[PDB]
Amino acid sequence: PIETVPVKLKPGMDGPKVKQWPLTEEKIKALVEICTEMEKEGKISKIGPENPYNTPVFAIKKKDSTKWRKLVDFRELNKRTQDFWEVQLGIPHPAGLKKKKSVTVLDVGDAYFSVPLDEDFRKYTAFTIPSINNETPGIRYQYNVLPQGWKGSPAIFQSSMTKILEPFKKQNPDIVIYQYMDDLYVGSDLEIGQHRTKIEELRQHLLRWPFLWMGYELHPDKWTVQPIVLPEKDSWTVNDIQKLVGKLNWASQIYPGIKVRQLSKLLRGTKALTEVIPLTEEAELELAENREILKEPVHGVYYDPSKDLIAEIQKQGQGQWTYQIYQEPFKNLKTGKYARMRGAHTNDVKQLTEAVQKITTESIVIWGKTPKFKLPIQKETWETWWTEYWQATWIPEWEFVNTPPLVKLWYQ
Amino acid sequence: MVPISPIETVPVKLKPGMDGPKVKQWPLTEEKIKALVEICTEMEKEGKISKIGPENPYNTPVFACKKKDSTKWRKLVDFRELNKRTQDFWEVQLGIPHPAGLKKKKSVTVLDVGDAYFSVPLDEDFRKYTAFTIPSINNETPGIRYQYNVLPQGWKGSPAIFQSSMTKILEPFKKQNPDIVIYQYMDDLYVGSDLEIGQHRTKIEELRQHLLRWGLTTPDKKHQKEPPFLWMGYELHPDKWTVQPIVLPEKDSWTVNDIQKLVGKLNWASQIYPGIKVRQLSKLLRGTKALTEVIPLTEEAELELAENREILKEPVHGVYYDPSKDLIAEIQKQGQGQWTYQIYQEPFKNLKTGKYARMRGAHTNDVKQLTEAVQKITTESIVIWGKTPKFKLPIQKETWETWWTEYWQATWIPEWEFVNTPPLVKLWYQLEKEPIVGAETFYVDGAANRETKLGKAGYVTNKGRQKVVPLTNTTNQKTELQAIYLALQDSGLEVNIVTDSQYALGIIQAQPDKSESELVNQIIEQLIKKEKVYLAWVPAHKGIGGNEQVDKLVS
DNA sequence: AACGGCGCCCGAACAGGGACTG
DNA sequence: CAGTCCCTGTTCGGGCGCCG
Numbered sequence A: 001p002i003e004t005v006p007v008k009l010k011p012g013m014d015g016p017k018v019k020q021w022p023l024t025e026e027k028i029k030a031l032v033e034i035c036t037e038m039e040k041e042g043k044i045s046k047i048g049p050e051n052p053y054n055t056p057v058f059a060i061k062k063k064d065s066t067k068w069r070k071l072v073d074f075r076e077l078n079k080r081t082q083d084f085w086e087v088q089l090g091i092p093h094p095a096g097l098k099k100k101k102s103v104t105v106l107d108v109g110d111a112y113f114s115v116p117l118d119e120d121f122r123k124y125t126a127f128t129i130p131s132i133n134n135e136t137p138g139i140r141y142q143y144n145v146l147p148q149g150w151k152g153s154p155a156i157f158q159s160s161m162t163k164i165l166e167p168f169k170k171q172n173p174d175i176v177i178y179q180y181m182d183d184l185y186v187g188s189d190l191e192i193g194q195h196r197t198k199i200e201e202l203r204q205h206l207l208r209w210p211f212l213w214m215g216y217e218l219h220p221d222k223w224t225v226q227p228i229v230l231p232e233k234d235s236w237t238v239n240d241i242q243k244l245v246g247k248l249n250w251a252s253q254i255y256p257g258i259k260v261r262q263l264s265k266l267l268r269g270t271k272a273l274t275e276v277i278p279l280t281e282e283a284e285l286e287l288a289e290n291r292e293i294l295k296e297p298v299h300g301v302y303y304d305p306s307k308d309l310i311a312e313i314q315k316q317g318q319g320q321w322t323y324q325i326y327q328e329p330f331k332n333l334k335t336g337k338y339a340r341m342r343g344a345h346t347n348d349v350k351q352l353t354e355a356v357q358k359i360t361t362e363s364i365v366i367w368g369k370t371p372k373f374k375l376p377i378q379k380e381t382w383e384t385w386w387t388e389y390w391q392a393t394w395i396p397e398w399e400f401v402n403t404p405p406l407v408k409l410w411y412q
Numbered sequence B: 001m002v003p004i005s006p007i008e009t010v011p012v013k014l015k016p017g018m019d020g021p022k023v024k025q026w027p028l029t030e031e032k033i034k035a036l037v038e039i040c041t042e043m044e045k046e047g048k049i050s051k052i053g054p055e056n057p058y059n060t061p062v063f064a065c066k067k068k069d070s071t072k073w074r075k076l077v078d079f080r081e082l083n084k085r086t087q088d089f090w091e092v093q094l095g096i097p098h099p100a101g102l103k104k105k106k107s108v109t110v111l112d113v114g115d116a117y118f119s120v121p122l123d124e125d126f127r128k129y130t131a132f133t134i135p136s137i138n139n140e141t142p143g144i145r146y147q148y149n150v151l152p153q154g155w156k157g158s159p160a161i162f163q164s165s166m167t168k169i170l171e172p173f174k175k176q177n178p179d180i181v182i183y184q185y186m187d188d189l190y191v192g193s194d195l196e197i198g199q200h201r202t203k204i205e206e207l208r209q210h211l212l213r214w215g216l217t218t219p220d221k222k223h224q225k226e227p228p229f230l231w232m233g234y235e236l237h238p239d240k241w242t243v244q245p246i247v248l249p250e251k252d253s254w255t256v257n258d259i260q261k262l263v264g265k266l267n268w269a270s271q272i273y274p275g276i277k278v279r280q281l282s283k284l285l286r287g288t289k290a291l292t293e294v295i296p297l298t299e300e301a302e303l304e305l306a307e308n309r310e311i312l313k314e315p316v317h318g319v320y321y322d323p324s325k326d327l328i329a330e331i332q333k334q335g336q337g338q339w340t341y342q343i344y345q346e347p348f349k350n351l352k353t354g355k356y357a358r359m360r361g362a363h364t365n366d367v368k369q370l371t372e373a374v375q376k377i378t379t380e381s382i383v384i385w386g387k388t389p390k391f392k393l394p395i396q397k398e399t400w401e402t403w404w405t406e407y408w409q410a411t412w413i414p415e416w417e418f419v420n421t422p423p424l425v426k427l428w429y430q431l432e433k434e435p436i437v438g439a440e441t442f443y444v445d446g447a448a449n450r451e452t453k454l455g456k457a458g459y460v461t462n463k464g465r466q467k468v469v470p471l472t473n474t475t476n477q478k479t480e481l482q483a484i485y486l487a488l489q490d491s492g493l494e495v496n497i498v499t500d501s502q503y504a505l506g507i508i509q510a511q512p513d514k515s516e517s518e519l520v521n522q523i524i525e526q527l528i529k530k531e532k533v534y535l536a537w538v539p540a541h542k543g544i545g546g547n548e549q550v551d552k553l554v555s
Numbered sequence C: 001a002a003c004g005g006c007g008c009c010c011g012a013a014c015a016g017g018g019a020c021t022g
Numbered sequence D: 001c002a003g004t005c006c007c008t009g010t011t012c013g014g015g016c017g018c019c020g
């Protein structure tokens, strides 16, 4: 009884044609069981090979959850319908969500299954379930309702979502509610008991209309930044000052007031690397001034909503990972560091996976966007293991880099 | 008035703005003339081909070759112009089934659908786009033109439609027989069960009659009821499997196209024959772009080929997959970037073997290449068995721990254990983390002219030692590597080296043990002889230490 | 002399970043 | 500041094996 909202691709673009990658046995068995129930419920239907479009699919388990969840890699389809969920029916981002003391993320993707999808657009939601050892050809489906993981789903359901959340927002005018992809971000300044009590009222408010029982909690007021810090030693060697000048020279690309004149004067001649160099009176002055500039904020750094967010990650060793988020080079909007995540001291890929998920979550709260990541890993290494550790219902864009650390810039 | 088959049709459209095929026929021999006129007459009575007239302004030629070495002939249409204008299909064939992924089944039957493509209907609105004339005489009778009511062989959409139509027909039978395994690859059907031989043939006949309801025939010609079964190019026995006999050509004078077929068979043979190498044979296929050019076999390619033929002498076989047992993968280093592995569940009962010998990067080390071989085995194992095997690797736990914890990139290996089978993989040198007290400090640099390609390279040290070497036909990058080489040559066992070259430092910090650059290989040889080496970087053109002094010398 | 699938080893074309020259 | 170079990387299409 609902008229399907017309959905069109961006002009001049064809639908996604991305190959399905191999899945483990437990993932295929999970997807076969899930798709069988969805087909019995009419959410998906089998299709033939005359549909040239395809989108990868796999399965995940969220944090502390034993239940398999179907996840479609709609990244290609999403950027081929970008003028829909950003120009026609866009969701405004609340600037106060990041200021709230506690923010709980609720999985509401199952509500999208109640709204039919435009018949002319269902062909672009095609996916293929693989088989072990290629026993059978691929089992192809396409969606009949709004699919989870498609940016057009919360955009179309937004009108339906507003009416559902309208009584609750009137009951609590201080609560900030943000919707991104399949998730709902609920932030408040109430106490932990008061917050979780209000979260359950919202759950019951949604029930009167399979992962609604979970509530991942955030605390953006506790989020920290990792500035550039300089070492403080009692004695300095030629090697120490050579590393310091190298760090300050690169840092001058961010803070133009940094000087290295009185410090390079200490390195006059051809001295041994371990020779102790006492800092002169002017060198102490120049090093003290540089430490204050690193505390001052960077000039003219603000968020541009029309530009993409970029995230770079550095492996620092011993469970330490630093990251920077920017839109223009050396104009970082945020710098941070993670330590002692899951997989620390045993698994780099699980840590890097965890770090990407945290950075994306922070970007959704602060700006409403997911950044494109520059991952310090080989492509084949990441593509072999990352789905084993993924616990989120969205997937950011990423590319692969290889920058040897000439100077430890973000972590001494 | 042709009867509509029970198989549901597949709606096939064309690319917009384009029409159908209009290609003239190809003059062929009279042997092909008397072998296709009888086909278009038999298919017309069976409803597989209908005759058209002047209302169908299309045409397409058809060249024919014999069937797969048998009494029958094969008809294939040249739809290369129809494929350029037909809509794209998404292929549902995602890979090739491997016999090592088959589980033990008490009873096994291999079927083969007769007239696969000729038993599946074509779209009603698409039959008009398949027009072709048949001249009974090469230059007399104009010949009545026919059309296709089924799937023609040669069309780019025929395989995808048959595989999808076959699945929909097997779905109701598989739902009524869950314990029966049906490997469906094109038209050949591998049917297996743990039922008794008597009860197994009963369900086979039930399946044969089920397929017959849609016009799918399973004749007794290619019906296999007893081992060894010929399935997917293998020999399937009740408890083991092997590849069909592989014959390597033995010529006196070898050309380019012969080595390509030789390396191809050795790749196909390396899935069960352990220790096959194709490094030195494929090395002969470099540079020369003349397929009909004689290439003499090098001494390294001759010894490699002689060792491959001796492996193929003794017959080998693989076993089948048992889900109750673990998967084990063990890797050996064959030298010169060559790796061989075996995947098994019980010792010396290999499911399959394989090799990894890809050289990626100008500079690398054995640890990087071992990591790559592990990733290749993991993805291959997920395709065949859907899980990752436990690895047995010829690298100490301490060696691996040192590499991955110190590398700047994320790297990881799944659950594994050390196996002591030399040659062990190790790191051949370790750069120091702090400067070395008492070791001479070399400030190195090198510059080169973009135009004349001339350059210099040298160093200055804290003890007054100095060198400048002029170089001819070089680059800025090469002189920076040369400067580090000079400092390693002229230093003691412990040395501190200061450079401003991000390029040179990046190569050496990754601890390579092999390189496509002779200069880097010489640098590696020096780094191994040292006891301690500390590399330090400084920004160029900043008046920093001796770097400013050595910069004046070489520029 | 056809179609589709997968694998390997190959080279040409292309992208991208440091560094020097006008 | 552009426009090159040098070096190193990925993508892709074709050679071959094999299947239907």
Ligand SMILES: Cc1cn([C@H]2C=C[C@@H](COP(=O)(O)OP(=O)(O)OP(=O)(O)O)O2)c(=O)[nH]c1=O
Binding pocket: B068, B112, B113, B114, B115, B116, B117, B153, B154, B186, B187, C003, D020
């Ligand atoms: C071997 C082969 C096959 N095919 C297509 C056609 C039918 C299926 C199976 O081929 P087939 O089993 O050898 O012949 P088929 O048409 O089934 O006839 P039968 O011998 O089974 O009676 O794949 C093809 O298009 N080109 C080929 O070279």
Ligand SMILES: [Mg+2]
Binding pocket: B112, B113, B114, B115, B116, B187, B188
């Ligand atoms: Mg057949």
Ligand SMILES: [Mg+2]
Binding pocket: B445, B446, B480, B500, B501, B540
């Ligand atoms: Mg230099």
